[PDB]
Amino acid sequence: CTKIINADSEDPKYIINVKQFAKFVVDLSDQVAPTDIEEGMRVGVDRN
Amino acid sequence: RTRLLDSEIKIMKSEVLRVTHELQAMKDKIKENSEKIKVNKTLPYLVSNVIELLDVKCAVIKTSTRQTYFLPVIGLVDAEKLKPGDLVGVNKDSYLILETLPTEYDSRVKAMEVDERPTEQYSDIGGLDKQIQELVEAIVLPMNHKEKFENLGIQPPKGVLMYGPPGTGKTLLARACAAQTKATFLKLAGPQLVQMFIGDGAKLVRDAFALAKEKAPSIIFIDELDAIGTKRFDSEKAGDREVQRTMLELLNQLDGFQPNTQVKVIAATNRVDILDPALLRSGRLDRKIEFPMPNEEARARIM
Amino acid sequence: KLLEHKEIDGRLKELREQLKELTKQYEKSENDLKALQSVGQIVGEVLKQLTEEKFIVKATNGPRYVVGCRRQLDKSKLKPGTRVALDMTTLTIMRYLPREVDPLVYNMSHEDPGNVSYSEIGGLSEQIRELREVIELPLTNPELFQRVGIIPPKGCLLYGPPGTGKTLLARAVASQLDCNFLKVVSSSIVDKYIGESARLIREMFNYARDHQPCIIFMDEIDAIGGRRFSEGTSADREIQRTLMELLNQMDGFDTLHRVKMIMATNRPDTLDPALLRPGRLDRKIHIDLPNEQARLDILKIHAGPITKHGEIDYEAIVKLSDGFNGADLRNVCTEAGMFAIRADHDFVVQEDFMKAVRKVADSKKLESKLDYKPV
Amino acid sequence: CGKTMLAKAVAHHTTAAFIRVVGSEFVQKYLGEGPRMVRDVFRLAKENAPAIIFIDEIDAIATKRFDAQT
Ligand SMILES: Nc1ncnc2c1ncn2[C@@H]1O[C@H](COP(=O)(O)OP(=O)(O)OP(=O)(O)O)[C@@H](O)[C@H]1O
Ligand SMILES: Nc1ncnc2c1ncn2[C@@H]1O[C@H](COP(=O)(O)OP(=O)(O)OP(=O)(O)O)[C@@H](O)[C@H]1O
Numbered sequence: 001c002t003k004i005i006n007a008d009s010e011d012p013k014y015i016i017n018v019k020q021f022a023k024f025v026v027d028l029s030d031q032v033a034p035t036d037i038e039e040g041m042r043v044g045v046d047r048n
Numbered sequence: 049r050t051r052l053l054d055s056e057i058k059i060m061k062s063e064v065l066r067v068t069h070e071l072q073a074m075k076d077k078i079k080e081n082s083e084k085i086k087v088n089k090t091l092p093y094l095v096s097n098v099i100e101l102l103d104v105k106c107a108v109i110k111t112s113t114r115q116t117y118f119l120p121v122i123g124l125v126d127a128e129k130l131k132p133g134d135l136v137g138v139n140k141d142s143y144l145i146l147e148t149l150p151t152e153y154d155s156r157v158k159a160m161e162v163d164e165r166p167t168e169q170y171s172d173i174g175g176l177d178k179q180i181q182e183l184v185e186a187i188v189l190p191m192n193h194k195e196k197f198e199n200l201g202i203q204p205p206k207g208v209l210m211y212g213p214p215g216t217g218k219t220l221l222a223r224a225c226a227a228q229t230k231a232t233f234l235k236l237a238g239p240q241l242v243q244m245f246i247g248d249g250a251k252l253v254r255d256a257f258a259l260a261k262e263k264a265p266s267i268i269f270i271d272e273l274d275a276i277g278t279k280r281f282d283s284e285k286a287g288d289r290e291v292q293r294t295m296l297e298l299l300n301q302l303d304g305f306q307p308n309t310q311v312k313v314i315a316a317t318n319r320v321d322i323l324d325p326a327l328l329r330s331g332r333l334d335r336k337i338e339f340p341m342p343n344e345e346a347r348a349r350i351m
Numbered sequence: 352k353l354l355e356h357k358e359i360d361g362r363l364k365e366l367r368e369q370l371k372e373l374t375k376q377y378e379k380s381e382n383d384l385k386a387l388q389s390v391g392q393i394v395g396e397v398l399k400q401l402t403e404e405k406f407i408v409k410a411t412n413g414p415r416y417v418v419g420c421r422r423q424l425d426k427s428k429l430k431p432g433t434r435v436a437l438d439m440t441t442l443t444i445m446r447y448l449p450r451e452v453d454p455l456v457y458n459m460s461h462e463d464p465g466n467v468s469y470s471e472i473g474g475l476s477e478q479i480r481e482l483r484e485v486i487e488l489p490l491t492n493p494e495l496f497q498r499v500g501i502i503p504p505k506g507c508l509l510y511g512p513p514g515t516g517k518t519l520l521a522r523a524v525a526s527q528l529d530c531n532f533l534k535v536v537s538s539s540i541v542d543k544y545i546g547e548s549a550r551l552i553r554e555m556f557n558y559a560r561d562h563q564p565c566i567i568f569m570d571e572i573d574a575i576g577g578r579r580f581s582e583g584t585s586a587d588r589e590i591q592r593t594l595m596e597l598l599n600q601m602d603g604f605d606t607l608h609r610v611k612m613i614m615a616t617n618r619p620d621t622l623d624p625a626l627l628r629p630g631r632l633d634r635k636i637h638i639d640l641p642n643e644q645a646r647l648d649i650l651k652i653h654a655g656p657i658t659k660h661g662e663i664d665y666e667a668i669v670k671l672s673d674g675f676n677g678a679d680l681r682n683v684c685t686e687a688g689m690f691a692i693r694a695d696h697d698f699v700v701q702e703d704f705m706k707a708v709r710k711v712a713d714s715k716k717l718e719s720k721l722d723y724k725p726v
Numbered sequence: 727c728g729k730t731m732l733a734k735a736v737a738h739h740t741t742a743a744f745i746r747v748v749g750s751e752f753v754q755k756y757l758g759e760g761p762r763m764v765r766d767v768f769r770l771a772k773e774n775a776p777a778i779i780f781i782d783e784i785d786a787i788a789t790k791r792f793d794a795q796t
């Protein structure tokens with residue numbers, strides 16, 4: 001589980017953050033809509 | 049007509065080379081984009097910071113796993129649009145920079161932005177029409193008549209301060225002006241700029257005045273300024289120091305080295321003698337207006 | 352006739368143009384086809400040298416390694432102290448590097464396009480010649496000091512009441528050097544990590560020795576200066592470590608030469624006596640409230656581009672201006688137009704100036720009025 | 727009062743090895759670097775010579791109060 005910094009326009013391209021490690025640029029899965037992935041929200045994220 | 053059949057042979061042969069020419073570029077783009085989307089579907093981007101851009105065309109980056117790397121080849125982004133201090137998107141395994149990420153904003157600064165437009169109108173505020181006027185014209189006129197101050201030629205006033213007894217209405221003008229001007233209104237609490245770790249309250253101030261630097265029409269509001277603006281003191285053996293650091297940048301990030309006329313500051317306290325005189329100088333906070341208690345006729349108007 | 356040959360060239364040259372321009376869009380996109388095979392390189396540092404081939408390094412990550420090189424990369428030049436690049440997979444040395452320049456300091460060096468000059472400052476030309484004496488005179492003419500037999504001072508600080516021109520005076524110096532003038536806000540240099548507050552003060556002054564004619568400017572040192580403590584909170588533990596790194600890099604075991612330091616504060620009451628020592632801060636320049644001749648001067652500087660009418664008695668404004676700063680005289684020139692901004696007078700009458708003084712004169716009734724004294 | 731000055735004069739007329747550290751550099755960023763940085767100073771003063779260690783501003787290291795939570 002992680003924490004989201006922000007989204008950006010034209011694309012999903014979400015900026016994510018974790019506890020001490022780096023920040024990534026991530027994507028959704030198919031099972032969830034891009035509605036309730038609002039900014040500043042903790043989300044669960046696979047390890048690969 | 050003799051050379052018309054020989055020059056038509058030179059035209060018909062080269063035009064047939066154009067059929068293989070457009071077929072040459074149409075075929076070249078598959079194998080190049082088959083690997084270009086391959087490094088785009090390596091979408092996890094270990095973001096970093098560009099430390100330095102070499103010349104013997106090369107760059108040194110520091111990933112956010114606290115790892116530094118050297119690269120001989122820069123990558124999909126050229127060297128002109130980059131500069132030290134930027135933050136980019138880097139491949140995981142190759143450690144090759146791919147994109148250019150825009151900004152670096154704390155999420156606590158994003159909570160400070162209003163998106164609600166709290167509607168209050170000036171007729172709700174009785175008995176302050178002297179104070180209502182000189183607050184509007186000292187803020188709104190440098191946003192809607194820019195040339196009018198430059199027609200004469202002066203620098204416009206920067207920073208207002210309202211003070212007085214606690215029930216006289218100080219938030220009420222600030223909620224009025226958030227409903228009038230359609231600019232970037234940005235609000236602050238007093239003790240919001242106090243953090244457990246060192247430097248975080250200092251970093252939180254410069255993020256706000258950089259975010260209001262971006263929205264060039266913007267005014268910034270500070271409520272209960274005596275939380276951070278307490279007067280400094282010399283003491284051995286004890287004493288807070290860390291809250292002075294957030295103030296001493298708020299002095300500097302407002303006024304001093306590299307000034308600007310793009311943001312306006314509205315500050316509201318109810319006690320003044322607590323404050324450090326370094327932030328009541330003339331140039332940091334210009335117009336110090338006071339809100340007295342209503343005399344007789346305003347009390348008829350208020351109720 | 353060859354006129355039918357020129358008509359046929361308009362199709363062939365338009366056909367060969369679709370070969371070069373369409374492949375040029377395939378040319379640059381072919382550069383990325385093989386640019387995506389270079390691998391990043393671990394940045395390390397050489398510790399000593401065992402044999403011709405046995406090298407021993409430490410990365411900027413962590414652990415210390417024992418490493419080899421290529422046989423072509425000038426093994427005599429890897430001095431203990433240098434900064435090198437490594438391999439990721441086999442972990443060998445590929446390339447020597449120069450020093451790093453830590454982009455907080457790169458974004459501290461030359462980001463000021465400010466173009467103010469000595470004409471804009473007024474009222475304190477006695478101290479301007481005094482301040483010139485340490486940063487401009489021995490940098491151009493060192494032999495006069497060598498003939499007498501004394502060393503020029505290292506650095507001096509500027510103290511005074513708020514709004515007399517302590518920041519402004521250094522901005523006049525800032526428009527003179529433009530590459531080796533280092534201005535520091537003294538609050539960007541602190542963060543929440545362990546030693547990163549003290550790594551900058553090392554690496555600022557390392558950058559100062561690399562550009563030998565250079566000036567360090569240190570505004571609002573009361574954040575980092577302090578006195579000392581009997582250790583109240585846990586925050587000011589590691590600030591005094593950041594402070595004692597500063598005191599040592601001035602005059603401990605180093606020829607502090609050609610590196611001048613200029614410091615400013617509103618109150619020097621809260622400074623460490625180890626930092627106000629005449630070894631580290633040499634002269635103490637006191638800036639005061641402006642005199643009536645100085646208030647005459649500062650007013651005329653800020654009353655320049657004011658569209659007025661020629662009846663301005665500049666004496667009576669100064670006659671009421673008692674105990675003012677250099678900053679509120681800019682406010683009087685500002686607020687005089689605020690009476691012109693009502694009733695649409697594009698000019699400024701002389702009457703509005705005496706209106707402007709009397710509103711500033713009682714707005715500073717709520718000040719504190721403590722001068723201040725370095726002790 | 728010539729604290730640093732007298733150490734300069736000793737390190738000029740000496741015949742022994744002189745090791746000169748600033749005592750605010752043991753606080754490295756990474757964990758464990760500092761205690762490694764201590765123990766190889768005295769190992770270098772062991773292997774080299776009948777040497778001399780000079781440490782300045784021990785107030786950066788040796789204080790009185792501590793806090794095992796930060
Ligand atoms: N002697 C002067 N001549 C002209 N302008 C002055 C003078 N002194 C102050 N000012 C004006 O005052 C404003 C503030 O200057 P500055 O910030 O240098 O004050 P300061 O001495 O740095 O006070 P503080 O250290 O508290 O910030 C400047 O915009 C400058 O125009
Ligand atoms: N014979 C002397 N006795 C004392 N001080 C001297 C003598 N000759 C010169 N000094 C001056 O004393 C200054 C301080 O030297 P030094 O740095 O050793 O003092 P210190 O006690 O180490 O002070 P600090 O610990 O604050 O650095 C020198 O820069 C020098 O100018």
Ligand SMILES: Nc1ncnc2c1ncn2[C@@H]1O[C@H](COP(=O)(O)OP(=O)(O)O)[C@@H](O)[C@H]1O
Nearest residue numbers: 172173174175213214215216217218219220350
């Ligand atoms: N015309 C008025 N003048 C003064 N106060 C008013 C007026 N109209 C409403 N108020 C009341 O003043 C309050 C504003 O609080 P305020 O005095 O700004 O708090 P503080 O000054 O301590 O931040 C509102 O709750 C409002 O009910």
Ligand SMILES: [Mg+2]
Nearest residue numbers: 218219271316
């Ligand atoms: Mg309030």
Ligand SMILES: [Mg+2]
Nearest residue numbers: 304517518519
């Ligand atoms: Mg200043």
Ligand SMILES: [Mg+2]
Nearest residue numbers: 603729730731
């Ligand atoms: Mg000493």
